[PDB]
Amino acid sequence: MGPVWRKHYITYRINNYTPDMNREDVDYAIRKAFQVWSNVTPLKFSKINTGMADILVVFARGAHGDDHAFDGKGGILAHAFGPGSGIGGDAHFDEDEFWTTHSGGTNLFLTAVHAIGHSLGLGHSSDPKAVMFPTYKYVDINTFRLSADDIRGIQSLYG
């Protein structure tokens, strides 16, 4: 019923990089996360380095200029606005978390897949196998796959 992007070419921009990770690893994690959803839809995502992107990717802590403060280490890991102009689509990651490429800390790739779900208009799944389940779970990110419920969800919006 809700907001959806009404175009197939979507842009994203990385506003700032967490110091927790190698810059190339931030780039690859977010890229790979967008690929997850483009693999099952007609959407295409392109990274831009200047200008206004649809989806601004931000690492920030506490109160950071929207109405939804972060809460320090623990609890909230990230949030994302649904499709829309301005802040719509934007995905914010709590810098008080310790972001990684692996099972330690909080995996940036897995969090971004979930956050980007929301940026594309998905809500939460009650299916504990689904990436859009509300609770973070680390799974070997090599071999990661969307569930049938996640696929049904995003195809209900875009496909």
Whether residue 140 contacts residue 106, with contact meaning beta carbons closer than 8 Å, is answered with no
94 binds, among Zn ion, Ca ion, none (CB under 5 to 8 A by kind): Ca ion
Pick the closer one to Ca ion by CB: 57 or 130.
57
How many CB atoms lie under 10 A from the CB of residue 13?
Answer: 18
Assign 79 to helix, strand or coil: strand
Task: Tell me if 66 contacts Zn ion by CB under 5 A.
Answer: yes
20 binds, among Ca ion, Zn ion, none (CB under 5 to 8 A by kind): Ca ion
Distance (Å, rounded) from C-alpha 109 to C-alpha 115? 10
Counts for the chain of helices (H) and strands (E), in that order: 3, 7
Task: Identify the residue whose tokens are 């990089």.
Answer: 17
The side-by-side arrangement of strands in the sheet containing 9-14 is: 44-47, 9-14, 55-60, 91-94, 78-80
Residue 29 token pair: 């994690």
150 binds, among Zn ion, Ca ion, none (CB under 5 to 8 A by kind): none
* Residue in the shown chain whose Cβ atom is closest to Zn ion: 92
At position 132, the amino acid (one-letter code) is M
Q: How far is the CB of 35 from Ca ion (least distance, A)?
A: 20
Which of 92, 108, 113, 154 touches Zn ion by CB under 5 A? Answer: 92
Q: Which residues bind Ca ion (CB under 5 A)?
A: 20, 71, 75-76, 88-90, 94-95
7 binds, among Zn ion, Ca ion, none (CB under 5 to 8 A by kind): none
Pick the closer one to Zn ion by CB: 44 or 134.
134
75 binds, among Ca ion, Zn ion, none (CB under 5 to 8 A by kind): Ca ion
Distance (Å, rounded) from C-alpha 110 to C-alpha 117? 11
Pick the closer one to Ca ion by CB: 10 or 146.
10
* Residue numbers at the binding site for Zn ion (CB under 5 A): 66, 68, 92
